[PDB]
Protein backbone atom coordinates (compact mmCIF):
# COMPACT_ATOMS: atom_id res chain seq x y z
CA UNK A 1 0.00 0.00 0.00
CA UNK A 2 1.43 3.43 0.98
CA UNK A 3 3.55 4.49 2.87
CA UNK A 4 3.85 7.91 3.13
CA UNK A 5 3.21 11.41 0.90
CA UNK A 6 5.13 14.35 0.88
CA UNK A 7 4.58 18.10 -0.45
CA UNK A 8 6.57 21.22 0.20
CA UNK A 9 6.30 24.26 -1.72
CA UNK A 10 9.34 26.99 -1.36
CA UNK A 11 10.02 30.09 -2.01
CA UNK A 12 12.16 30.99 -4.55
CA UNK A 13 13.47 34.31 -2.33
CA UNK A 14 13.77 32.10 0.27
CA UNK A 15 15.99 29.97 -0.73
CA UNK A 16 18.07 33.23 -1.98
CA UNK A 17 17.72 34.81 1.55
CA UNK A 18 19.03 31.00 3.09
CA UNK A 19 21.43 30.29 0.84
CA UNK A 20 23.23 34.44 0.74
CA UNK A 21 23.38 33.99 4.58
CA UNK A 22 25.86 31.21 5.27
CA UNK A 23 28.42 29.83 2.60
CA UNK A 24 27.51 26.31 2.74
CA UNK A 25 24.02 26.54 2.12
CA UNK A 26 23.47 24.69 -1.56
CA UNK A 27 26.59 22.21 -0.70
CA UNK A 28 24.62 21.27 2.13
CA UNK A 29 21.71 20.39 -0.01
CA UNK A 30 23.19 19.07 -2.82
CA UNK A 31 24.75 15.85 -3.59
CA UNK A 32 28.19 15.51 -5.61
CA UNK A 33 26.81 14.66 -8.55
CA UNK A 34 23.77 17.53 -8.26
CA UNK A 35 26.26 19.65 -7.73
CA UNK A 36 28.13 19.03 -10.32
CA UNK A 37 25.45 20.20 -12.28
CA UNK A 38 24.67 23.33 -10.36
CA UNK A 39 28.02 24.98 -10.73
CA UNK A 40 26.90 25.26 -14.52
CA UNK A 41 24.37 26.92 -13.98
CA UNK A 42 23.32 30.90 -14.27
CA UNK A 43 22.93 32.41 -11.04
CA UNK A 44 19.17 32.69 -12.15
CA UNK A 45 18.72 28.67 -13.10
CA UNK A 46 21.19 27.90 -10.07
CA UNK A 47 18.40 29.02 -7.84
CA UNK A 48 15.85 27.56 -9.73
CA UNK A 49 17.70 24.14 -9.56
CA UNK A 50 18.33 24.61 -5.89
CA UNK A 51 14.49 25.45 -5.14
CA UNK A 52 13.41 22.15 -7.26
CA UNK A 53 15.95 19.87 -5.25
CA UNK A 54 15.11 21.43 -2.17
CA UNK A 55 11.46 21.00 -2.44
CA UNK A 56 11.68 17.62 -3.63
CA UNK A 57 13.83 16.16 -1.09
CA UNK A 58 11.73 17.94 1.22
CA UNK A 59 8.73 16.19 -0.02
CA UNK A 60 10.86 13.09 0.30
CA UNK A 61 11.57 13.21 4.06
CA UNK A 62 7.82 14.31 5.03
CA UNK A 63 6.59 11.34 3.04
CA UNK A 64 9.33 9.32 4.74
CA UNK A 65 7.97 10.94 7.90
CA UNK A 66 10.98 11.89 9.27
CA UNK A 67 11.54 15.35 7.76
CA UNK A 68 15.26 16.34 7.77
CA UNK A 69 17.40 15.27 10.64
CA UNK A 70 19.07 12.95 12.34
CA UNK A 71 17.09 9.77 10.76
CA UNK A 72 17.46 11.29 6.96
CA UNK A 73 19.75 13.52 5.75
CA UNK A 74 19.70 15.65 2.15
CA UNK A 75 22.70 14.24 0.93
CA UNK A 76 20.73 10.96 1.81
CA UNK A 77 18.70 11.86 -1.18
CA UNK A 78 19.34 12.49 -5.02
CA UNK A 79 16.94 14.04 -7.46
CA UNK A 80 17.83 12.32 -11.34
CA UNK A 81 16.01 12.55 -14.48
CA UNK A 82 15.33 9.66 -16.80
CA UNK A 83 15.74 9.87 -20.97
CA UNK A 84 12.39 11.47 -20.80
CA UNK A 85 13.25 14.19 -18.41
CA UNK A 86 11.24 12.83 -15.65
CA UNK A 87 12.56 13.28 -12.11
CA UNK A 88 12.78 10.09 -10.16
CA UNK A 89 14.22 9.81 -6.61
CA UNK A 90 17.71 7.37 -5.48
CA UNK A 91 17.26 7.14 -1.54
CA UNK A 92 20.37 4.82 -0.11
CA UNK A 93 17.74 4.01 2.17
CA UNK A 94 14.64 2.22 0.08
CA UNK A 95 14.34 1.02 -3.04
CA UNK A 96 14.02 3.63 -6.12
CA UNK A 97 10.92 1.06 -6.99
CA UNK A 98 9.08 2.20 -3.93
CA UNK A 99 9.27 5.78 -5.10
CA UNK A 100 7.44 8.65 -6.94
CA UNK A 101 8.05 12.36 -7.51
CA UNK A 102 6.85 15.29 -9.08
CA UNK A 103 8.09 18.58 -9.44
CA UNK A 104 6.77 21.64 -10.93
CA UNK A 105 7.69 25.85 -10.97
CA UNK A 106 6.07 29.30 -11.36
CA UNK A 107 8.16 32.28 -11.62
CA UNK A 108 8.33 33.07 -7.65
CA UNK A 109 8.13 29.17 -6.16
CA UNK A 110 9.22 25.71 -6.44
CA UNK A 111 7.34 22.62 -5.71
CA UNK A 112 7.23 19.25 -5.23
CA UNK A 113 5.44 15.94 -3.89
CA UNK A 114 6.29 12.51 -3.42
CA UNK A 115 4.59 9.05 -2.60
CA UNK A 116 6.30 6.26 -0.87
CA UNK A 117 4.58 2.74 -1.38
CA UNK A 118 5.28 -0.32 0.98
CA UNK A 119 6.90 -3.07 -1.37
CA UNK B 1 -5.65 0.91 -4.47
CA UNK B 2 -5.98 4.10 -4.49
CA UNK B 3 -9.82 5.46 -3.69
CA UNK B 4 -9.12 9.21 -4.04
CA UNK B 5 -6.55 12.31 -4.08
CA UNK B 6 -6.81 16.20 -2.52
CA UNK B 7 -4.69 18.98 -3.36
CA UNK B 8 -5.52 22.30 -1.42
CA UNK B 9 -3.64 25.77 -1.43
CA UNK B 10 -5.30 28.31 0.66
CA UNK B 11 -3.43 32.20 0.93
CA UNK B 12 -3.32 33.09 4.37
CA UNK B 13 -4.10 36.35 3.81
CA UNK B 14 -8.17 35.15 2.93
CA UNK B 15 -8.03 32.93 5.94
CA UNK B 16 -7.36 36.34 7.91
CA UNK B 17 -9.80 38.03 6.17
CA UNK B 18 -12.71 35.13 6.48
CA UNK B 19 -11.68 35.01 10.03
CA UNK B 20 -12.37 38.85 10.59
CA UNK B 21 -15.68 39.24 8.67
CA UNK B 22 -16.95 36.04 10.38
CA UNK B 23 -18.38 35.31 13.08
CA UNK B 24 -16.87 31.88 15.11
CA UNK B 25 -14.68 31.00 11.83
CA UNK B 26 -11.94 29.24 14.09
CA UNK B 27 -14.81 27.29 15.83
CA UNK B 28 -16.19 26.04 12.57
CA UNK B 29 -13.35 24.73 10.90
CA UNK B 30 -11.00 23.34 13.99
CA UNK B 31 -12.67 20.27 16.55
CA UNK B 32 -12.33 21.06 20.04
CA UNK B 33 -8.42 19.66 20.58
CA UNK B 34 -7.29 21.53 18.29
CA UNK B 35 -9.37 24.62 19.33
CA UNK B 36 -7.50 24.05 22.64
CA UNK B 37 -4.49 24.14 20.70
CA UNK B 38 -5.33 26.70 18.71
CA UNK B 39 -6.09 29.68 21.45
CA UNK B 40 -3.23 28.98 23.16
CA UNK B 41 -1.10 30.98 19.94
CA UNK B 42 0.18 33.98 19.45
CA UNK B 43 -1.88 36.00 16.89
CA UNK B 44 1.06 35.39 13.50
CA UNK B 45 0.75 31.30 14.84
CA UNK B 46 -3.04 31.38 15.18
CA UNK B 47 -3.39 32.07 11.33
CA UNK B 48 -0.94 29.92 9.89
CA UNK B 49 -2.26 27.30 11.99
CA UNK B 50 -5.95 27.98 11.48
CA UNK B 51 -4.43 28.06 7.32
CA UNK B 52 -3.07 24.65 7.36
CA UNK B 53 -5.77 22.82 9.45
CA UNK B 54 -8.37 24.48 6.65
CA UNK B 55 -5.86 22.97 3.64
CA UNK B 56 -6.12 19.95 5.21
CA UNK B 57 -9.55 19.24 5.55
CA UNK B 58 -9.94 21.24 2.08
CA UNK B 59 -7.89 18.01 0.67
CA UNK B 60 -9.11 15.29 2.71
CA UNK B 61 -12.93 16.03 1.60
CA UNK B 62 -11.87 16.37 -1.58
CA UNK B 63 -9.95 12.35 -1.45
CA UNK B 64 -13.10 11.39 0.59
CA UNK B 65 -15.54 12.68 -2.62
CA UNK B 66 -18.10 14.64 -0.67
CA UNK B 67 -16.33 18.17 -0.36
CA UNK B 68 -17.24 19.88 2.95
CA UNK B 69 -21.13 19.65 3.36
CA UNK B 70 -23.93 17.92 4.58
CA UNK B 71 -21.95 14.44 4.29
CA UNK B 72 -19.07 15.76 5.62
CA UNK B 73 -18.26 18.83 8.44
CA UNK B 74 -14.88 20.22 9.56
CA UNK B 75 -15.68 18.78 12.84
CA UNK B 76 -15.77 14.84 11.55
CA UNK B 77 -11.70 15.70 10.60
CA UNK B 78 -8.88 16.25 12.69
CA UNK B 79 -5.16 16.16 12.53
CA UNK B 80 -2.56 14.93 14.63
CA UNK B 81 1.07 14.83 15.13
CA UNK B 82 2.90 11.32 15.88
CA UNK B 83 5.77 11.27 17.33
CA UNK B 84 7.98 12.47 14.73
CA UNK B 85 5.67 15.12 13.87
CA UNK B 86 4.31 13.84 11.11
CA UNK B 87 0.73 14.90 10.86
CA UNK B 88 -2.52 12.37 10.40
CA UNK B 89 -5.67 12.39 10.11
CA UNK B 90 -8.53 10.89 11.84
CA UNK B 91 -12.30 10.47 10.88
CA UNK B 92 -13.82 7.53 12.05
CA UNK B 93 -15.74 7.37 8.40
CA UNK B 94 -12.67 5.60 7.41
CA UNK B 95 -9.94 4.01 9.09
CA UNK B 96 -7.02 6.35 10.19
CA UNK B 97 -4.61 3.48 8.78
CA UNK B 98 -6.39 4.23 4.93
CA UNK B 99 -5.44 7.58 5.12
CA UNK B 100 -2.54 9.59 4.49
CA UNK B 101 -1.92 13.57 4.25
CA UNK B 102 0.93 16.23 4.16
CA UNK B 103 1.22 19.90 4.97
CA UNK B 104 3.44 22.55 4.12
CA UNK B 105 4.05 26.13 3.98
CA UNK B 106 5.37 29.13 2.96
CA UNK B 107 5.26 33.05 3.73
CA UNK B 108 1.84 33.76 2.27
CA UNK B 109 0.43 30.47 1.90
CA UNK B 110 -0.74 26.93 3.36
CA UNK B 111 -1.20 23.69 1.44
CA UNK B 112 -1.86 20.49 1.85
CA UNK B 113 -2.46 16.90 -0.03
CA UNK B 114 -4.01 13.80 1.06
CA UNK B 115 -4.42 10.41 -0.48
CA UNK B 116 -7.04 7.92 0.73
CA UNK B 117 -6.32 3.95 -0.20
CA UNK B 118 -9.13 0.95 -0.13
CA UNK B 119 -8.44 -0.98 2.28
CA UNK C 1 -1.20 -3.19 -8.16
CA UNK C 2 0.61 0.06 -8.01
CA UNK C 3 1.40 3.48 -8.84
CA UNK C 4 3.00 3.92 -11.81
CA UNK C 5 3.37 7.66 -11.69
CA UNK C 6 2.59 10.88 -10.04
CA UNK C 7 2.64 14.48 -11.25
CA UNK C 8 2.00 18.23 -9.62
CA UNK C 9 2.05 21.59 -11.67
CA UNK C 10 0.62 24.68 -10.21
CA UNK C 11 0.11 27.74 -12.50
CA UNK C 12 0.22 31.80 -12.54
CA UNK C 13 -2.97 32.74 -14.00
CA UNK C 14 -1.46 35.84 -15.07
CA UNK C 15 0.99 33.97 -16.84
CA UNK C 16 -1.71 32.08 -18.30
CA UNK C 17 -3.26 35.35 -19.47
CA UNK C 18 -0.04 36.75 -20.68
CA UNK C 19 0.04 33.59 -23.50
CA UNK C 20 -3.68 33.92 -24.23
CA UNK C 21 -3.55 37.28 -25.23
CA UNK C 22 -0.84 37.58 -26.97
CA UNK C 23 -0.84 33.97 -28.59
CA UNK C 24 -3.27 32.34 -31.20
CA UNK C 25 -5.72 30.60 -30.24
CA UNK C 26 -3.96 29.74 -27.33
CA UNK C 27 -7.14 28.05 -25.71
CA UNK C 28 -8.13 26.06 -28.64
CA UNK C 29 -4.79 24.65 -28.52
CA UNK C 30 -4.96 23.72 -24.60
CA UNK C 31 -8.47 22.54 -24.72
CA UNK C 32 -10.60 19.70 -26.19
CA UNK C 33 -13.95 20.48 -28.39
CA UNK C 34 -15.76 19.96 -25.17
CA UNK C 35 -13.95 21.64 -23.01
CA UNK C 36 -13.77 24.55 -25.23
CA UNK C 37 -17.75 24.46 -24.97
CA UNK C 38 -17.88 24.79 -21.56
CA UNK C 39 -14.70 27.84 -21.47
CA UNK C 40 -16.89 29.76 -24.67
CA UNK C 41 -19.79 29.73 -21.98
CA UNK C 42 -17.35 31.47 -19.01
CA UNK C 43 -17.05 34.87 -18.23
CA UNK C 44 -12.98 36.78 -19.18
CA UNK C 45 -12.83 36.31 -16.22
CA UNK C 46 -14.00 32.47 -15.39
CA UNK C 47 -12.34 31.95 -18.68
CA UNK C 48 -8.89 32.71 -16.92
CA UNK C 49 -9.49 30.57 -13.99
CA UNK C 50 -10.91 27.29 -16.28
CA UNK C 51 -8.03 27.20 -18.48
CA UNK C 52 -5.58 27.57 -15.96
CA UNK C 53 -7.23 25.21 -14.23
CA UNK C 54 -7.79 22.69 -16.78
CA UNK C 55 -3.85 23.34 -18.16
CA UNK C 56 -2.31 22.33 -15.01
CA UNK C 57 -4.14 19.32 -14.65
CA UNK C 58 -3.02 18.74 -18.21
CA UNK C 59 0.08 19.47 -17.09
CA UNK C 60 0.48 17.29 -14.05
CA UNK C 61 -1.01 14.15 -15.65
CA UNK C 62 1.64 14.27 -18.43
CA UNK C 63 3.88 14.57 -15.92
CA UNK C 64 2.59 11.27 -13.68
CA UNK C 65 2.77 9.71 -17.25
CA UNK C 66 5.89 10.25 -17.40
CA UNK C 67 6.65 12.27 -20.78
CA UNK C 68 5.48 15.55 -20.06
CA UNK C 69 3.61 17.72 -22.95
CA UNK C 70 5.04 16.78 -26.52
CA UNK C 71 5.78 14.13 -29.05
CA UNK C 72 4.41 11.29 -27.06
CA UNK C 73 1.68 12.93 -25.53
CA UNK C 74 -0.54 16.11 -26.31
CA UNK C 75 -2.81 18.40 -24.61
CA UNK C 76 -5.30 17.32 -26.48
CA UNK C 77 -4.81 13.33 -25.75
CA UNK C 78 -6.12 14.11 -22.51
CA UNK C 79 -9.78 15.18 -21.76
CA UNK C 80 -11.18 16.69 -18.11
CA UNK C 81 -14.43 16.04 -18.00
CA UNK C 82 -17.11 16.81 -14.89
CA UNK C 83 -19.29 14.58 -13.17
CA UNK C 84 -22.69 14.89 -11.68
CA UNK C 85 -21.69 17.06 -8.89
CA UNK C 86 -19.51 19.26 -11.23
CA UNK C 87 -16.47 17.34 -9.90
CA UNK C 88 -12.95 16.83 -12.39
CA UNK C 89 -11.95 13.44 -13.83
CA UNK C 90 -9.68 12.92 -16.18
CA UNK C 91 -9.98 10.84 -19.65
CA UNK C 92 -7.19 9.31 -21.31
CA UNK C 93 -7.56 6.88 -24.08
CA UNK C 94 -4.37 6.75 -25.27
CA UNK C 95 -3.73 5.29 -21.37
CA UNK C 96 -3.86 1.40 -21.00
CA UNK C 97 -7.30 0.87 -18.68
CA UNK C 98 -5.44 2.29 -15.98
CA UNK C 99 -7.06 4.27 -13.06
CA UNK C 100 -6.55 7.87 -13.14
CA UNK C 101 -7.32 10.54 -10.29
CA UNK C 102 -6.84 14.27 -10.25
CA UNK C 103 -7.28 16.82 -7.79
CA UNK C 104 -7.68 20.85 -8.88
CA UNK C 105 -6.99 23.79 -6.57
CA UNK C 106 -7.48 27.30 -7.18
CA UNK C 107 -6.53 30.58 -5.30
CA UNK C 108 -7.00 34.08 -6.33
CA UNK C 109 -3.79 34.02 -8.30
CA UNK C 110 -2.66 30.44 -8.79
CA UNK C 111 -3.98 27.19 -10.30
CA UNK C 112 -2.72 23.91 -9.46
CA UNK C 113 -3.38 20.12 -9.76
CA UNK C 114 -2.31 17.03 -8.96
CA UNK C 115 -2.81 13.35 -10.56
CA UNK C 116 -1.78 9.90 -9.83
CA UNK C 117 -1.72 6.99 -12.14
CA UNK C 118 -1.96 3.81 -11.29
CA UNK C 119 -1.16 0.59 -13.09
CL1 LIG D 1 9.17 28.69 1.72
CL1 LIG E 1 20.24 13.39 -13.93
CL1 LIG F 1 7.53 15.59 -12.65
CL1 LIG G 1 4.65 33.05 -9.51
CL1 LIG H 1 -9.69 11.37 -6.68
CL1 LIG I 1 -7.23 30.56 -1.13
CL1 LIG J 1 -14.33 16.98 24.93
CL1 LIG K 1 3.83 16.23 6.20
CL1 LIG L 1 5.19 33.13 0.07
CL1 LIG M 1 3.44 29.15 -14.00
CL1 LIG N 1 -10.71 11.92 -10.18
NA1 LIG O 1 27.93 18.45 0.46
NA1 LIG P 1 -7.68 27.88 -2.22
NA1 LIG Q 1 7.93 26.17 2.43
NA1 LIG R 1 4.12 26.40 -13.51
NA1 LIG S 1 -10.61 13.71 -7.88
Redesign the interface.
Given at each position: ??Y????????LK?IASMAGRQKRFAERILTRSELDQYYELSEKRKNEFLAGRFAAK??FS??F???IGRQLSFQDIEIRK?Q???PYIICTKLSPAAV????????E?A???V?I?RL
Open positions: GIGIGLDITEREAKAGTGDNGKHVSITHTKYAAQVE
